[PDB]
């Protein structure tokens, strides 16, 4: 067990899907995994392991923000032998061209966090996903006929930013979506030699429960299917 | 309701105790409060409201890290009329003398996060607690015969930091404890015109992560929570 | 002696009041102290030691700006065995409800100087006063019937800042007063293991551009010094 | 014409291969292109335009470093309707398991330049390539029996860095190769709404001090240009 | 022979003039220099060595940008026994009284590049020219009956800056011209114990963007070179 | 009168010499000036006006540190029509070739202060002196048969730096002397359109840490003042 995870080596698969919401992880395990058992409940951060089309797969919330997910992903990679992390969350759009409910894949993630600067001697570290995983997600999305843009995310430290101007800058530089974890996860993946990817669904443009349901399931399918592609 | 809290004005007291652990909020609610009603369960971030010695009080987790706690503290202040946040958590010690199960009070909080620089034109904002709230906790501690030290906390962005030397730096300038939230909560409070305080038990020394028995953990915890609640009553006077 | 103080160990009390102006220090020694003797005149930065109600106490100017006061406070702490430093000066107010002649006590001190980032590996160091010193001042002030607000100061590097917008930032985040030394002095105290407090009187309002008259100055000045001295004796208990 | 390119709209294709060396640009037009008409020679920065397997294609030097290549790529995009830009150059390796003559594709580019900060309010802009162009190059490399590693480059401002420690950091975070332009190119691409890509061949190993020979240089170089050209075709389909 | 210069010790005089343009360096060798011999052409960065009034003197391009010229000037100093570097280029003016085609001598050079911060522990290094070299350029200029303005240059990383507002800042602080190298060359000069100077002719107005003829650009260019060459002779005395 | 200078227009010459020590300003006025009159004594910062070889000249302390001198130089320039400031103080050497009592002239001034970044949009401002004033100083030193080196000073915020390693960096990049004002003064000169120059005598080594008599300290001190006064007469050409 780790300081934040009450489980033993083997309890997780070598690939973990991670929403921000513990309850989202719960719904994923119950909806897409088979014979899914609970493996973590410390701090209510619900973690489950099961199988998807024969493939052993884990899902577990990571909570909100870079420092929260940095703890969880780190402990998974170093003490649970996890190799691939796929964050599956939502984000805000700044580009008018980006439609509500669109699926975005962050090959990169900008940030206003300082954690990568602390890692990289206060220089510019390009927080990037694993290309193979990005590819797998793009293919899996086509096989499902779902349109998915591939580009930069922006990982915010402040959900409620005192600087509205920054949004004009993100837009000028083509940021697909604004969330709060990607850049941080990519940093941890680089620090501890694993691989990761963030996939999001535009929950709103920052500028009903019906659609919001399947649109979520699309993303999960893409994530799950993409693992199978990577398995080949 | 707010995006992260499913409740309505009045569901919260004007004061909120906040541990990082939602489960710790549930324990506090059940252990110390009367007639506790759960008021939020969004993202599993449990919040409760009840009374302590006649006083209406709330307790709710804030999650780990400045960004997490910054969301909840903000929403409570803007949409739930909260006037006071008391963070109740645990920290790792850097100073040789600070004893385990010593209660540290963060009148100030250092940090390596960038959020206050973003707020303060990239100058040095001193993230501080409300002075009166600090005195109230100091006073409650003395009444309860509990050793409390007042000074600087340090709020880390990285629980697993690659910069090990920083702890020597923290030690040199007298940082009392390391956690991951204080400086962000103080930021929100200043930005949004509220008052805040962080109190922490000492869970270990950062160098030489000792083992801690369940008993001494629960015992020192209970003392912290009592200082929190009592200091509120003092402030009410 | 030190490069900037021509004196011997023991020529200073373990507590030193410090105005920025040496002439104010002179005035303090002759007006409030008994048997005051001059202990320094290097660079005309006059220093004195005498007694107040049977208590050995010193007073000495620190000059203007963090670099200047950083020198004297350091030398006092390391080479004269000084344990406590109380800065007494004036500040400009950025908040409307902070009134001319108000007494402000800086539990924290913001800054745009780089000295603390130099000490603290370029992270956010919360430049804080010593808590007991703060409470001593608050109490000593209540006893004297004088109102005092406790919060953040802002220590500026440039008296004539090219950045007018910054004041609006200070006001948004609740800065009580603008001066030029506290954060620096707090930094020295953290670095060399001593205790510091900064007390200011509002000598003008950056918004209304109002200034204190000749007579108003002395009135509030004596109140400030009285709160300083009468906070030491509380500390001695 | 632009201030650094004495050509006119039409002279370039919508795709431009760009080595640092102008002579290497000359070499490409002569060896891999047909009907190669020189379109520029200002400051000796040779630029050409021929065709490859029927596809209209340009090739031009960008000079050494971010500032240099920022000028050219900017003018190409905004004044010559260029849509894609593929850099082709050599890089140093810090990873042990990255061997000489390797083909690294930078989907990301780290840097110690300040240009992206100036662009991005001093926050962290992740300088990235266009994804399609990245896959196009990976696929073309497969079709030619080459294993192209995708990941981060480091774009240095100083070929002769005074900070030897930095190479360890690059290695620690998996930087595939060290060059001097990728990050700035990706920067211009985003600023002006264009697609860019950087392909590099490991010409030496910073650690072991090995360096490719004259022949290995020309061999791998050709393979690189081949992948570069072929990839463009894949993108057209 | 170095990575970017194909030549051996002695092939360069101990003083080198450097335009940004290789072709400008060629023009100089063939026009001002006697017995001019090409000593480099790697990457097309043409380098020459000949004599001026009996004095051995070299002239070579340095390309555009701090990173580009940092390579060449560095390699000249440590591998070719170069003692003096004189940059000879053009700059854009921000000040009103700085006239088109005026000759500006960079006694200091500001920059928005991070290279000196990387050298100087993230503090402010004043990137300055060598005094005597400056005096020599001033005197030699008076002899030629040419007015030269001595002051600050600004070395930009971006020729196409996203921050127009910055030029207003340069104007306010008395920046005589905006180029792209001076600060890097002074950086290298200080790092490796050499002496450097940048001279520039005002090519245009950042402000009025009027225009100049080739024939008058030529006149000014020659004045700059004559001043450069003559200043060397003054130094030898 | 200004907030820190109790005098009226005309009381000061258009050139003001300024040591850090007010008592040093008093000594200069008594020793070199004729018909010297005190024109300021606020905060004990004595200022004087008189004549030297028939030339009207002022001398006044500026205190210790960039923040203190910035206040005085600004007020003198904007409210007393002062056009030229000549700092005359002491510094520490880091270079072996810089011997005790050497006279160094700061053509440039590095710094770890943030004041110039606040001014210059967080870019590198090359804090420079007026060239003519520098040359005037060099020449007046020649005629007086005194050795004076021209180069970079370094203006420190902390006389007691927690970063001892920075002194190695100062040496590596040729810093002639270490003081606490030059960069600030030059920043003011540039901001308010005046001209400044800092001259220093080497008072000690941060290397060997030796000192001299009270006899030769004054000897070379007078030499510095002579160079500064004579340099003004030269500038009257």
């Amino acid at each position: 067990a780790t300081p934040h995870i009450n489980a033993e080596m083997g309890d997780f698969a070598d690939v973990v899907l991670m929403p921000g919401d513990p309850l989202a992880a719960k719904y994923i395990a119950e909806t897409f995994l088979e014979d899914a058992r609970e493996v973590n409940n410390v701090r209510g951060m619900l973690g489950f392991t099961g199988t998807y089309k024969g493939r052993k797969i884990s899902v577990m919330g990571h909570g909100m923000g870079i420092p929260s997910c940095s703890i969880y992903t780190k402990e998974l990679i170093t003490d649970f032998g996890v190799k691939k992390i796929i964050r599956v969350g939502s984000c805000g759009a700044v580009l008018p061209h980006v439609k509500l409910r669109d699926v975005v894949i962050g090959m990169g993630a900008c940030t206003d966090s300082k954690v990568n600067r602390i890692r990289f001697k206060d220089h510019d570290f390009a927080a990037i996903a694993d290309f193979d995983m990005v590819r797998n997600a793009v293919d899996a999305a086509k096989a499902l006929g779902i349109d998915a843009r591939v580009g930069n995310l922006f990982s915010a430290d402040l959900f409620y930013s005192p600087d509205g101007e920054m949004f004009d800058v993100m837009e000028k530089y083509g940021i697909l979506g604004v969330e709060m974890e990607a850049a941080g996860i990519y940093g941890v993946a680089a620090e501890f030699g694993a691989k990761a990817l963030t996939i999001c669904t535009v929950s709103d443009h920052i500028r009903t429960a019906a659609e919001r349901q399947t649109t979520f399931n699309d993303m999960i399918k893409i994530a799950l299917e993409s693992v199978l592609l990577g398995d080949k």
Side-chain angles (χ1 to χ4, degrees), chain A:
Chain A
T2 50
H4 299 93
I5 308 185
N6 198 179
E8 295 308 321
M9 172 63 84
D11 290 5
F12 289 89
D14 59 25
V15 173
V16 187
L17 279 66
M18 309 187 77
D21 187 355
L23 304 189
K26 184 160 165 290
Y27 165 93
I28 293 170
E30 296 177 0
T31 300
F32 302 90
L33 302 197
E34 300 166 31
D35 314 310
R37 75 194 175 279
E38 180 189 294
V39 292
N40 174 255
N41 62 180
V42 171
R43 292 177 181 256
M45 201 50 65
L46 295 187
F48 312 91
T49 305
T51 70
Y52 179 74
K53 299 184 180 181
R55 215 302 190 191
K56 185 180 180 182
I57 301 284
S58 290
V59 55
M60 172 179 164
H62 57 48
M64 301 190 289
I66 285 171
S68 182
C69 64
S70 293
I71 298 176
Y72 291 109
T73 51
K74 185 284 183 184
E75 294 183 358
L76 286 175
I77 295 159
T78 63
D79 294 49
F80 290 93
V82 177
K83 306 172 182 175
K84 286 192 186 184
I85 291 156
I86 302 184
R87 156 167 162 78
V88 287
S90 63
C91 64
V94 279
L95 302 174
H97 328 259
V98 180
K99 317 179 300 297
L100 216 78
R101 275 194 292 159
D102 291 0
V103 167
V104 307
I105 308 179
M107 59 169 160
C110 307
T111 189
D112 53 18
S113 171
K114 210 173 89 170
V115 302
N116 288 153
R117 296 204 179 173
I118 290 165
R119 290 183 173 117
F120 221 57
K121 295 202 67 156
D122 193 48
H123 298 313
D124 286 22
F125 174 79
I128 65 185
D130 170 285
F131 168 82
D132 287 354
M133 299 181 58
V134 177
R135 182 170 48 189
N136 295 337
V138 171
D139 297 338
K142 153 165 287 193
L144 279 162
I146 315 169
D147 308 315
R149 296 193 184 85
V150 189
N152 254 342
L153 292 162
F154 181 104
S155 306
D157 260 6
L158 290 180
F159 191 92
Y160 299 98
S161 176
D163 187 4
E165 169 188 342
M166 186 57 202
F167 297 106
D168 294 335
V169 186
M170 306 187 195
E171 185 187 358
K172 175 171 178 190
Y173 288 94
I175 277 67
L176 298 188
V178 174
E179 44 84 74
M180 302 179 62
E181 288 83 11
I185 301 185
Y186 297 162
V188 170
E191 193 176 353
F192 304 95
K195 301 169 184 174
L197 176 70
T198 300
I199 308 180
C200 295
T201 285
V202 179
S203 62
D204 68 307
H205 221 280
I206 326 171
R207 321 313 268 106
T208 186
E211 309 82 27
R212 293 165 56 244
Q213 162 72 177
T214 309
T215 197
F216 170 91
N217 291 155
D218 283 344
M219 202 213 317
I220 298 301
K221 294 177 183 182
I222 298 178
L224 296 169
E225 290 303 338
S226 87
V227 174
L228 296 175
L229 291 182
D231 287 327
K232 133 267 153 284

